Amino acid sequence: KLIISTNEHASTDQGKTVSNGESWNTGLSINKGESAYINANVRYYNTGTAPMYKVTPTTNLVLDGDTLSTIKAQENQIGNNLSPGDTYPKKGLSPLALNTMDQFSSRLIPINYDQLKKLDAGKQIKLETTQVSGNFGTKNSSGQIVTEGNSWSDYISQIDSISASIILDTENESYERRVTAKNLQDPEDKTPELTIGEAIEKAFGATKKDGLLYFNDIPIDESCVELIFDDNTANKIKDS
Amino acid sequence: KLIISTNEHASTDQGKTVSNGESWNTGLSINKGESAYINANVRYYNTGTAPMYKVTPTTNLVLDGDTLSTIKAQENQIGNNLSPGDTYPKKGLSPLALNTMDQFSSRLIPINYDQLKKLDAGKQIKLETTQVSGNFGTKNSSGQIVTEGNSWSDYISQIDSISASIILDTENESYERRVTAKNLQDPEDKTPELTIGEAIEKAFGATKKDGLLYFNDIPIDESCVELIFDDNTANKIKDSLKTLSDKKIYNVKLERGMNILIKTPT
């Protein structure tokens, strides 16, 4: 959801002069620069295989074709824990409000008069996430778990460059996985070779019944599901 | 309770002209972007088995279906100590006031004019907590207690994923516990097996009298209390009952993800 708070001053003054005399006056002052404020109710989710600690996403706000602002999550909108398949705030709670713009959460998000006019004319606003930063837990010299100073951004680029992405889209749920591939040009890349069937079996933990993979009870065999590729994957599959 | 501070100006002017006359005036201007400020009186509580140091909860404020704001606890609203069964502020004191939004507690919580005009029309605001941050105490190389840099958030997810939840809800008091379960798929999971009866005995420290568990004096046996499960636990427990000799709920093997809730009779 999105909430608009129109920023104008409204004054009503009345007098009584004494012959005789009375008066009434009204006013309406509006600032053309910062004419309204926007509050967005958001909600995070995880579809991977590992949790993310200290979730600090970055989002965009697009009215028509214009990015109104990009805001990184402050201390008020940081998710301490996010397990796979979970959601912050957890199911049954209410979405969190992203309504501050500066680093210390002491400044609201303004919009223009020509933007507020479109917003109240029957036009919607859109949200998209550019990036998300978090942490991961490891063990220090003792038996404790330390999750400070362990950024996922150090491994995102290194993982996306040597892996293929597979997204199983069941109903009311979604899964996304990365499976390590092998380079044939490099003779010193000793990564084990896999086919698409073995990749699907390993990524989602499917078990063969009669040689056909089943996820839990539904079938995911290539003749029982709809596969969607992009142009590059389709070209690399047709020739093979 | 919640407190509203309506934000408008109010000017009264009068003159005396000399021909002879007088004058009067009275005005009131309000801002329709930040028309009021809200103040919330909160009070923490603990129902676990371990204390939390430097309690820094995060709360939500919803008016009708709209989350007004989410505020993390500042230095003014941090509780240094919270033992199990206690509150902050302790019993006999007054609730603490949460009335600042920014990080340094120098900016109040505003609401809209369309939100104030609805609040004063006979509508209430609701508060729900989304997360809590705290610390735990360990011993360093000398023999002192260090509670800085020891976050519970590192163990919340690792504990919730291998445990079942048991909530004993007696009168004027509530308890919540986590008991470690066992995965039968993994052959290298050497966690001891447990039934629901043993889990209830261990979690709440109940002692058997004649084979029936008693908490302190009130019975907590499966026939003397009301058990409430969710759909998943109910389905997972209705199929293991048939393949049993005693057909007792307390004799079912404990598994990860259960949500057993125990309620004692009035």
- CA R_g for chain B: 27
The answer to whether B140 touches A142, Cβ cutoff 8 Å, is no
- Could you please state the CATH topology (level 3) that the domain comprising A1-135 is classified under: Jelly Rolls (2.60.120)
Contact list, A51 vs chain B (CB under 8 Å): 157
Chain A from 107 to 126: CB within 8 A of any B CB: none
DSSP string, A160-229: HTSEEEEEE--TT--EEEEEE---SS-TT--PPP--HHHHHHHHHT-EESSSSEESSSSB--TTTS----
Pick A14's closest partner by Cβ from B23, B26, B34. B26
Contact list, A93 vs chain B (CB under 8 Å): 60, 128, 130
> Does the beta-carbon distance from B70 to A83 stay under 8 Å?
no
- DSSP letter at B199 equals H
3-state secondary structure of A6: strand
**Chain B contact for A6, CB < 8 A?**
yes
Pick B128's closest partner by Cβ from A74, A94, A99. A94
Rounded CA gap, A87 and B131, in Å?
12
> Does the beta-carbon distance from B24 to A17 stay under 8 Å?
yes
Quote the tokens at residue B45: 């509580």
CA terminus-to-terminus distance, chain B: 29
Contact list, B72 vs chain A (CB under 8 Å): 75-76, 78
Burial class (CB in 10 A: 0-12, 13-18, 19+), B101: buried
**Chain A contact for B58, CB < 8 A?**
yes
Rounded CA gap, B152 and B129, in Å?
16
Backbone angles phi, psi at B145, to 5 degrees: -105, 125
Pick B32's closest partner by Cβ from A10, A17, A27. A10
Residues 6+ apart with CB under 8 A from A165: A176, A177, A178
Rounded CA gap, B123 and B120, in Å?
7
Residues 6+ apart with CB under 8 A from A121: none
Amino acid at A109: I
The answer to whether B2 touches B40, Cβ cutoff 8 Å, is yes
Rounded CA gap, A151 and A53, in Å?
10
Backbone angles phi, psi at B165, to 5 degrees: -105, 125
Quote the tokens at residue A33: 């620069």
3-state secondary structure of B35: coil
Q: Which residue is closest to A144 within chain B, CA to CA? A: B150
Q: Which residue is closest to A16 within chain B, CA to CA? A: B24
Which residue is listed with tokens 């400070």? A148
> Does the beta-carbon distance from A9 to B31 stay under 8 Å?
yes
**Chain B contact for A140, CB < 8 A?**
no
The answer to whether B182 touches B199, Cβ cutoff 8 Å, is no
Interface test with chain B among A71, A77, A80, by most B beta carbons within 10 Å: A80
Pick A5's closest partner by Cβ from B33, B69, B71. B33
Rounded CA gap, A178 and A174, in Å?
14
3-state secondary structure of A55: strand
Contact list, A106 vs chain B (CB under 8 Å): 101-104, 106-107
Please tell me the experimental approach by which this structure was elucidated: cryo-EM
- Angstrom CA distances, B85 to A126, B48, B51, B54, B262, stand at 46, 8, 9, 17, 18
Quote the tokens at residue B170: 């007696």
Instruction: List the resolution, Å.
Output: 3.1
Q: Which residue is closest to B107 within chain A, CA to CA? A: A106
**Neighbouring C-alpha atoms within 13 Å toward the C-beta of A175:** 12
Pick B104's closest partner by Cβ from A41, A94, A104. A104
The answer to whether A146 touches A139, Cβ cutoff 8 Å, is yes
Rounded CA gap, A171 and B141, in Å?
53
Q: Which residue is closest to A55 within chain B, CA to CA? A: B153
Q: Which residues pair with A28 in a beta bridge?
A: A10
Burial class (CB in 10 A: 0-12, 13-18, 19+), B79: buried
Please name which of B227, B204, B202, B224 lies closest in space to residue B212, comparing C-alpha atoms. Answer: B224
Contact list, A13 vs chain B (CB under 8 Å): 25-28
Pick A53's closest partner by Cβ from B30, B150, B153. B153
DSSP string, A91-140: TTS-PEEE---STTS-S--EE-HHHHHHHTTT---EEEEEEEEEE--EE-
Pick A75's closest partner by Cβ from B103, B107, B151. B103
Q: Which residues pair with A145 in a beta bridge?
A: A139
Ramachandran category for residue A21: left, alpha or beta (phi over 0 → left; psi -120 to 50 → alpha): left
**Chain B contact for A1, CB < 8 A?**
yes
